[PDB]
Amino acid sequence: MERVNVVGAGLAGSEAAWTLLRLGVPVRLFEMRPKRMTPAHGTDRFAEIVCSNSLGGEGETNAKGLLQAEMRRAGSLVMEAADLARVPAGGALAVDREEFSGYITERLTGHPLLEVVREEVREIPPGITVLATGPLTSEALAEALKRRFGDHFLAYYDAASPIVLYESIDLTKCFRAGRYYLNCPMTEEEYRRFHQALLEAQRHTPHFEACVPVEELARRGYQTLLFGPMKPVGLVDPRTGKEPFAVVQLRQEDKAGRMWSLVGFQTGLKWPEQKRLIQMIPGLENAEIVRYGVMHRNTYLNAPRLLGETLEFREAEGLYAAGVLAGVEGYLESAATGFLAGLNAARKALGLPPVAPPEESMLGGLVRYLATANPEGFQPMYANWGLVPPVEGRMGKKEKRQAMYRRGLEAFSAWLSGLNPPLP
Ligand SMILES: Cc1cc2nc3c(=O)[nH]c(=O)nc-3n(C[C@H](O)[C@H](O)[C@H](O)COP(=O)(O)OP(=O)(O)OC[C@H]3O[C@@H](n4cnc5c(N)ncnc54)[C@H](O)[C@@H]3O)c2cc1C
Ligand SMILES: N[C@@H](CCC(=O)N[C@@H](CS)C(=O)NCC(=O)O)C(=O)O
Ligand SMILES: [Mg+2]
């Protein structure tokens, strides 16, 4: 029988396959494990959880909590598995990893319309196909993607800097300018405090070579950051009429301008340390960090250059990407993009046009960011409140988040209800 190809049976591919199957579209699910393992995997199971067993905070104040709720409403297999494999984790949804992957593997393998092929896919399959090969996408397939779409549009590591919410910046301590960006000028004493704090800050341990984490630049000498990302070259501080001693620059990442990254602040610091350090920067004393910096091995595509919000390749009809390969980060985000890619692939198989959830929903905010974010040096994205529209008002952050949760979940549910054919 004719089948939609799903390449990779991780978080994204498992959900993509389930979505296709639910809509009555047969699937050919390729998985190279166990005979070819990635450096992080150890089993033959679909949707193996390779690290932490947390799927994110569940609260109505948590962006991941909204995405969890949306995925339940969608009938996600990953959420079913998580709900059944739930273990205690202080506010987070966390799972017994073996019960989680076991349930997913059983439900998929037992479906009459699923064929499993245990092989490494080395070339882009023809026909309707979802690619979901993850952060450790095999070398051969990565090479195939570079050949087809361009060497510069696939990355092997992320090197993300922190991103803050624009409204949380104190603009009285910044100036907008390009050399000769938002610029946060610093005095020599402020730089010295910041540099010293970087020397001692707690950092994660690796499991890049000209891309050096800022905390490591600090360790390589007092001058290093001043020659690098904190250089004031070509800038004039309107307050002094002179070149500032040092600056931190921020650049706009999203179309809406809610999300601004610290330029050149790639980092492997622990997240609480990043927050402490960031709030030492003039203008950022009360900054809300919506995406923390990270430095790791991570194969992914330039989503804004290559993908629509539908997760279909702009220049390859009926080809889709999901999961980390598509430019997201996180087990849940990967499953959720798998759902959407599978939905659109199923619709394609049925001769129907693709869909995408609304901007108010977390999944919608995420995929719309993938399609429209700044393409230059594009880095992966996880679920956060910067991705959806604000809730206007002067209520506190907790309340705004609760309002965003309710609004988003309702918007997502209405979107689901409008789908034809419906998810049964
Ligand atoms: C070391 C490490 C730790 C992580 N820790 C966390 C964490 O704590 N929390 C979190 O939310 N996320 C974590 N992730 C990030 C990410 O959310 C997970 O990697 C998540 O599983 C991504 O889902 P995915 O479906 O995109 O990829 P995966 O789940 O990795 O699935 C990809 C699948 O494709 C297969 N494959 C690859 N190439 C081919 C090929 N050419 N042919 C056939 N099959 C192929 C792989 O064997 C794999 O089964 C971690 C990732 C890594 C690498
Ligand atoms: N990860 C992508 C995007 C580019 C990238 O990661 N650049 C780094 C170089 S050190 C960067 O500046 N990170 C900090 C930031 O994005 O501001 C790539 O390998 O092509
Ligand atoms: Mg960046």
UniProtKB/Swiss-Prot annotation:
Cofactor(s) in the UniProt record: FAD
EC number of this enzyme: 2.1.1.74
GO BP annotations, alphabetical order: tRNA methylation; tRNA wobble uridine modification
Pfam family, one: GIDA
GO CC aspect terms: cytosol
Matching PROSITE patterns: GIDA_2
Keyword list, A-Z: Cytoplasm, FAD, Flavoprotein, Methyltransferase, NAD, NADP, Transferase, tRNA processing
InterPro entries cross-referenced by the UniProt entry: FAD/NAD-bd_sf, MnmG-rel, MnmG-rel_CS, MnmG_N, TrmFO
Keyword Membrane applies: no
Subcellular location(s) per record: Cytoplasm
Top-level class of the enzyme under EC nomenclature: transferase
Function: Catalyzes the folate-dependent formation of 5-methyl-uridine at position 54 (M-5-U54) in all tRNAs.
Family indicated by similarity: Belongs to the MnmG family. TrmFO subfamily.
Name of the protein in its database record: Methylenetetrahydrofolate--tRNA-(uracil-5-)-methyltransferase TrmFO
Source organism (scientific name): Thermus thermophilus (strain ATCC 27634 / DSM 579 / HB8)
